[PDB]
Amino acid sequence: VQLSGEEKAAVLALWDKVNEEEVGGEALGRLLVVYPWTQRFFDSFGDLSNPGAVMGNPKVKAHGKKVLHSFGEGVHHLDNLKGTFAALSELHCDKLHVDPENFRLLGNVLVVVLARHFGKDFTPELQASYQKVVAGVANALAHKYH
Amino acid sequence: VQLSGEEKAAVLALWDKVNEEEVGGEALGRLLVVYPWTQRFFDSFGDLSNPGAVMGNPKVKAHGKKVLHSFGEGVHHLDNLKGTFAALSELHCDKLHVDPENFRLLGNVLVVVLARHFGKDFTPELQASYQKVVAGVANALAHKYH
Amino acid sequence: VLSAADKTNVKAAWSKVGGHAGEYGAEALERMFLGFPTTKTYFPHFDLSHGSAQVKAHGKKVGDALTLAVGHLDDLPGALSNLSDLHAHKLRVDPVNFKLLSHCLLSTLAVHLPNDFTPAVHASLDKFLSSVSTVLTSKYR
Amino acid sequence: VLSAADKTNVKAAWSKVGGHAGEYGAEALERMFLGFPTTKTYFPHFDLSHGSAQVKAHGKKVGDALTLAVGHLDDLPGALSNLSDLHAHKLRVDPVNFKLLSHCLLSTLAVHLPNDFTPAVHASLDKFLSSVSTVLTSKYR
Ligand code: HEM
Ligand code: HEM
Ligand code: HEM
Ligand code: HEM
Ligand SMILES: [C-]#N
Ligand SMILES: [C-]#N
Ligand SMILES: [C-]#N
Ligand SMILES: [C-]#N
């Protein structure tokens, strides 16, 4: 993505403070509650009938950590997102059959969660950089679809 | 795009029969009628208040021909769509500020028009190939946005 | 939800489809499965080959639900109440898929009724399919 | 359009926003202009710099229209009739933009009301902003 040197520094300084477990469990939990059709992909996780069951579900937290850990890898590799997410793009496309539109949704949920956790420090300028970031990951994941 | 050798031949044999003027004027005309917000981008064209004015407008036909001529260039260059639409991607992004979502819309309108013109010859198999095609052009045009 | 003008074009266009609604429903499904492969994941129990008796039988139900909707443009949420439960609650169909099937329905109509498929009718049928789609995904809202 | 449960969360959440609706409206606009630059094309007559008196004055109107909507969740098309004419007829706002401003409104609320911004409230406000957005683009349907 097209990020100056001052943006890349701000984006990276924030990730130093991101707890992948806490933020990861929350982002995935909110995607499942706010956009219910996404639950279809995670039946094996058990009960996800209400917001309480979902947010407290151990498999949801564990999986959310995995997602954010790969997100962090993209952040530290903004010059080659398509190479970092190549295998994952095939996984979600060929095997899971997730419509790429949902990658944009999870990307935006993550941003809302970062906002919730960082408050005033998540400035309009910093959010703008993170939107380019989540968009670049979303695109790298949709790559193997066309 | 990922098109076999039998698909590429079918896609190309059909374009031999496409009148860029007739199909081009119709596709652009229907985009403007069916998705009214797109009219905003073509104020200079004059009156586009109703479906009759739009379809008969000379600037709409002339412009539609231009769009389809560039579409035809993409068809004959399916191995390097991003290079063929590089300048156009900058035009629509930097200057016009067209949201990439509208590229998908025009792509689908074109398909409906091809269906209308070719009837039974526009088989479900042939349409599937054309969906990969319009999607690949849409992606090449959105390139300069991220 | 639709304008009086739109309702008139919709009922008129559907009167020309007449008794082919089932056939167009089956064809639209085929065009969707081939053009947008991800949608096939919702029909693992179906034989999805061309001429499949199942998708023909299924296209008949789809066609019949749309004829029902046209005869009830003033109260779609009510007339389609059960389909909305089936699609959003039980199957959890991704909203994006409703746009794909709508595009394939319009494509099918354009093939079969080229002279009737005018710009004005096209715009009304698009609004009609958008309305039905909203009703069927209403449990997400 | 919304469930009774959703209406309750929406009125409750907005009561916590209280008198900051104008401020959050201005902040949400700023986050939108910076994060999604294409949207700035609709405001060529505005000074879009941080602290701009114009976007502050504008954010107040946006905030006030949302407070109006919350006090009329049972009849949005009526209460927002004039805004729908302005946005779809006169300005011809691309529907995609309503999703961008909604995301920035939720982002702003999350910054300012972290404890109140629970998963359940988040889901209801999303449905609320989706409903308002549908009403404002209704002239395309
Ligand atoms: C930014 C977007 C995303 C990222 C970075 C991401 C990342 C990942 C990662 C790292 C895995 C584990 C792969 C492995 O262990 O080999 C995974 C698996 C999975 N993802 Fe995603 N994902 C994304 C979006 C989505 C979305 C939107 C959905 C569905 C709505 C989805 C559904 C799944 C499922 C069902 C699995 C398999 C889970 C299992 O182990 O049962 N992903 N994803
Ligand atoms: C598949 C998608 C598209 C293709 C292949 C395409 C192609 C073109 C081409 C060839 C030109 C002329 C460039 C030149 O003469 O240098 C052009 C200009 C333009 N395009 Fe597109 N376009 C696409 C989609 C769109 C969409 C969706 C919109 C707006 C909703 C749009 C708005 C315009 C406008 C306003 C102009 C300038 C017209 C003028 O001369 O006043 N284009 N496009
Ligand atoms: C205009 C939009 C649609 C209409 C009118 C429609 C109508 C119907 C009808 C009438 C049924 C039959 C239920 C029964 O037999 O009781 C059905 C079932 C079903 N629909 Fe839809 N549908 C629509 C869109 C979709 C989409 C976009 C998908 C997914 C891509 C989908 C997937 C299914 C599935 C999987 C079933 C159950 C099939 C079976 O097991 O027999 N539908 N739909
Ligand atoms: C929740 C969604 C929205 C709400 C509640 C809303 C509300 C309003 C209100 C209350 C006004 C003032 C009209 C007046 O002063 O009479 C307005 C004007 C306007 N809105 Fe929106 N709006 C929304 C979304 C959008 C979006 C997405 C765009 C474009 C990105 C947009 C662009 C405009 C413009 C250009 C004006 C006229 C500004 C001026 O010239 O003073 N609005 N809107
Ligand atoms: C993937 N979560
Ligand atoms: C561009 N039309
Ligand atoms: C449902 N087809
Ligand atoms: C409108 N802002």
Residue numbers in the entry:
A (entry chain B), B (entry chain B): 1 to 146
C (entry chain A), D (entry chain A): 1 to 141
The authors write:
Hemoglobin (Hb) is one of the best-characterized macromolecules and is regarded as an ideal model for studies of protein evolution, cooperativity and allostery. In vertebrates, two heterodimers (α1β1:α2β2) comprise the oxygen-transporting functional tetramer contained at high concentration (∼5 mM tetramer, normal mean corpuscular hemoglobin per mean corpuscular volume) inside the red blood cells (RBCs). The release and uptake of protons by hemoglobin is known as the ‘Bohr effect’ and ionizable residues influenced by this effect are known as ‘Bohr groups’. In most models, Hb is proposed to exist in two states: a high O2 affinity R state and a low O2 affinity T state.
EqCNmetHb is a stable model for the liganded hemoglobin R state crystallized at physiological pH. Equine hemoglobin has 88% sequence identity to human hemoglobin and is considered to be isomorphous with human oxyhemoglobin, with most histidine positions conserved. The EqCNmetHb neutron structure was solved to 2.0 Å resolution using joint X-ray/neutron refinement, a resolution sufficient to accurately locate D atoms in macromolecules. The C2 symmetry of the EqCNmetHb crystals aligns the molecular dyad with a crystallographic axis, reducing the asymmetric unit to an αβ dimer and the number of His residues to analyze to ten for the α chain [residues 20(B1), 45(CD3), 50(CD8), 58(E7 distal), 72(EF1), 87(F8 proximal), 89(FG1), 103(G10), 112(G19) and 122(H5)] and nine for the β chain [residues 63(E7 distal), 69(E13), 76(E20), 77(EF1), 92(F8 proximal), 97(FG4 switch), 117(G19), 143(H21) and 146(HC3)]. Two conserved His residues [αHis20(B1) and βHis117(G19)] were determined to be doubly protonated (His+), with the occupancies of both D atoms refining to a value of 1. The H+/D+ occupancies of these two residues are clearly influenced by neighboring conserved acidic groups: αHis20(B1) is hydrogen-bonded to αGlu23(B4) and βHis117(G19) is hydrogen-bonded to βGlu26(B8). Interestingly, two His residues that are unique to equine Hb, βHis69(E13) and βHis76(E20) (Gly and Ala in human Hb, respectively), are the only others that appear to be doubly protonated in the R state and are also influenced by neighboring groups: βHis69(E13) is hydrogen-bonded to βGlu20(B2) (Val in human) and to βGlu73(E16) (Asp in human), and βHis76(E20) is buried in a crystal contact. All other His residues in the EqCNmetHb neutron structure were determined to be singly H+/D+-occupied (His0). In the EqCNmetHb R state, the Nδ1 atom of αHis103(G10) acts as a hydrogen-bond acceptor to a water which is bridged by another water to the side-chain N atom of βAsn108(G10).
